[PDB]
Structures are given as C-alpha cells and as structure tokens.
C-alpha cells in the first residue's frame, strides 16, 4: 500500500485496520470445563 496525505507539522501515525474474520466458539463440556478456540482468518491468531 502507498498513501499520499496532506502534510501536517506534528508527527502522526497511520491507523489502517484490516477487516478480518475474528470469531471464537466456547465449548463447555462438563461442570467446570470451559474451552474457547479462537480464529482470526487472514491474520493468523488463536
């Protein structure tokens, strides 16, 4: 990606955010067991 921007004096930062699929399903087998599996699909996670 290349960004052309209006220049301003004070130093700044870019906050591009990639819209992804960030989901998590919670499985509760029995009486005090909670297991959550995460999945961020483009940006690998969980």
């Amino acid at each position: 990606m290349t960004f052309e921007m209006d220049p301003i004096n004070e130093p700044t930062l870019l906050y591009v955010l990639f819209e992804v699929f960030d989901v998590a399903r919670v499985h509760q087998p029995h009486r005090g067991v909670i297991e959550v599996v995460y999945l961020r699909t483009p940006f690998s996670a969980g």
Binding site: P11, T12, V16, L17
Partner: protein, 50 residues
C-alpha cells in the same frame, strides 16, 4: 470491528508504504484513518511513561 489494527508512524510529510506477505483468506476490506502520535497511547504495557 472484526479487525486487526496496525499503526504505522508518519513523519510530518509525504507518503508511506506498509506490510509484507501473508494468506488473505476471508478478507473483508480495509479501514484507514490518520491519528496523532501524541494522542495515541501504548496499550501493551501496564504504564505508558511517554
């Protein structure tokens, strides 16, 4: 905002160029907006002295 936010610093002029390789499955799109370095904090630490 199922998303993955990445912040790239900007010297007070001109343009910039991000990002290396990856996979790109189930990608939904982009959302871009400029913030100020002074205003944006660092959330990765218990305290931000700067």
């Amino acid at each position: 905002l199922s998303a993955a936010n990445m912040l790239y610093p900007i010297p007070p002029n001109a343009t910039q160029l991000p990002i290396p390789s990856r996979n790109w499955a189930a990608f939904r799109g982009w959302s871009l907006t400029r913030l100020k370095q002074r205003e944006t904090p660092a959330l990765g630490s218990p305290f931000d002295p700067y």
